[PDB]
Design a protein around this ligand. Structure first.
Ligand SMILES: [Ca+2]
Ligand SMILES: [Ca+2]
Ligand SMILES: [Ca+2]
Lengths: 368, 368
């Protein structure tokens, strides 16, 4: 009767029932149990070419916390990151005792602007604790400059929360990265299991450390010898994870289809000619359809107009982090571009089961 | 063949499959979904006489973190707690930016000694940020004096991680407490579902706030207005929790029976006469069987002796927190009793399915 923003569809119980019965037989239910290891092994084989290492975590927000806590420089104070990201990103930083320092984004790709970033690193020197870029909207943010940062001794944790399963040229996003990449398996993201996350790194020793950190910093004596907490993923989450890997081809194909319908219908209804624009990026996997509305149109009015037509759009990210109550006083560079994107950005609905006619009803409402 | 220390048995899949069908039909998988709400309502009615409020969390460690972060006095530096606790407790404080300050325990009930705690509150004054007692080994640590601290403006968050389901005179442990109580649903704890936890308070508004904190500090506009992170429990975890509520009488009966057998066999084999002693408490629900070995016996000799008889005991908590690498340099009162109890404490196996003949094996081995 209406078009909601979110309609999650995780794999149904029949797809992971075998695994539930293995769990019941084994009487191991969490703490890096066999199903969790099998899930990690499957991911390393199917996505990461058996190079590097992964660990599951209970959610991507805990993964950011763990990665930042492990990798931050001891004497640093700031986590250099975009304001144009989900609040989880600066929150993970603050829980690690760091202050966010917001960096402006490019107007076209919506990633942190590397020119500004480099300049800020040069200026802050030892005050830089860590650099936390966001691979905006599950897209192909090239990591070449970030890999260079790691090699110069500036640690990098990439927030790719919504980008798991993003492939380009047959390579999975993040492959062989020196730093850490965090992905989310939240039910609302494309690889959605309910609650869950993953960390990848080419650095196997670092992944081994995060595994400890996720288990109270325990050594092999179950003695706490390093910072830690609990971010263990249960066997039950790993079970849905594994079943999701096996239906993933279908899901990726669904999203890709709906994405192409959006691009076609937008173009065919001449919305691009009216000044709507898509993100500039090589490759993306879409949680929703992000688009800039025309310069002369206020994005909150789009939301309101669509809401009259029974369609729920949203405004990721407006307010951006620097404009939100909690983060409004943290330092930043000039953020003119962020501010502009935050006035224009719209988030259009996209979920499994969406038909071409639904996309068309949305695209036509945009235009009228 | 070998008697292992832990042998978790969560309710089997058939017991929550209906709920899994509900989840699949609803397409709501997390973020305080209807099954999670049902679970919490079932707890409020079933355990807390519909007075106060609860929230699920992804695990008790994160619940501790949320609770301390909300309730800590903003000018304070220290979290006053026992050393004789699981490392999750001081780790939770350290993540909130506090230093643990360790307080000695009573030699008999093994709780934080209130006399020593009071003197220390009086000495530290504004430097006290929070008090975090542990209801050692799932027992009935009376909360009258802690309620008193709350009334005086000293915040208390009680770590009762292993004590969910603990009843005494028909009242659930923590009922009507003004502060917060954290409980765990880890698979190894008596009310075990995999990964999970719960927070109870008589203070409903505080619980509402914790809810927001565990969803990124979001208000109804999904804007971040307070410190927060992700500690949301999935619908799937709630599904198992609900099923665990229906079988809880069975689980509790099984554990009480095994405890009773332990007590009878220990007395009948003369072990009490030989200097072995149990916790002085009115009521306990048991994850394992804690016992002090005789003064002249080293508890770790008891471990190595049971070990070569195919029985895995452990030593919770030896080393105590103050003795573990990460926490050695935090301040404390004199800890003479904690040290003594950490030289004598032994953790004997107890799990669902343990037979009377298995307890007898064990108790007989203690007797030599
Ligand atoms: Ca199968
Ligand atoms: Ca049923
Ligand atoms: Ca039924």
């Amino acid at each position: 009767e209406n078009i909601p923003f979110l309609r999650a569809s995780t794999v149904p119980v029949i797809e992971y029932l075998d695994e539930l019965k293995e769990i019941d037989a084994s009487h191991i239910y969490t703490n890096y149990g066999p199903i969790n290891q099998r899930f990690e092994q499957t991911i390393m084989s199917g996505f990461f070419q058996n190079r590097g290492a992964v660990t599951t975590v209970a959610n991507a927000t805990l993964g950011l916390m763990a990665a930042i806590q492990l990798k931050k420089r001891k004497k640093g104070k700031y986590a250099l990151m975009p304001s144009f990201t989900f609040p989880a990103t600066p929150l993970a930083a603050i829980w690690c005792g760091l202050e966010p320092y917001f960096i402006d984004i490019s107007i076209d790709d919506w990633y942190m602007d590397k020119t500004v970033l480099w300049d800020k690193i040069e200026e802050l020197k030892e005050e830089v604790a860590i650099v936390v870029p966001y691979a905006t909207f599950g897209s192909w943010m090239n990591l070449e400059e970030y890999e260079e940062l790691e090699k110069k001794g500036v640690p990098v944790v990439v927030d790719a929360a919504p980008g798991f399963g993003l492939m380009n040229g047959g390579m999975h996003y993040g492959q062989d990265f020196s730093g850490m990449i965090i992905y989310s398996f939240h039910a609302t993201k494309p690889f959605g299991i309910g609650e869950g996350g993953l960390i990848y790194s080419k650095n196997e020793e670092d992944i081994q450390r995060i595994k400890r950190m996720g288990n109270f910093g325990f050594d092999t004596n179950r003695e706490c010898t390093m910072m830690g907490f609990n971010c263990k993923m249960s066997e039950y989450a790993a079970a849905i994870g594994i079943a999701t890997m096996k239906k993933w081809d279908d899901k990726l194909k669904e999203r890709t289809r709906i994405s192409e319908w959006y691009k076609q219908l937008l173009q065919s209804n001449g919305l691009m000619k009216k000044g709507w624009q898509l993100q500039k990026t090589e490759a993306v996997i879409q949680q929703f359809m992000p688009i800039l509305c025309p310069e002369e149109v206020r994005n909150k009015q789009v939301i309101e107009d669509l809401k009259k037509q029974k369609i729920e759009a949203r405004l990721y990210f407006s307010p951006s982090c620097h404009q939100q109550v909690l983060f409004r006083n943290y330092k930043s560079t000039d953020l003119t571009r962020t501010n502009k994107i935050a006035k224009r950005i719209v988030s259009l609905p996209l979920w499994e089961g969406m038909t071409k006619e639904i996309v068309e009803q949305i695209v036509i409402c945009l235009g009228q």
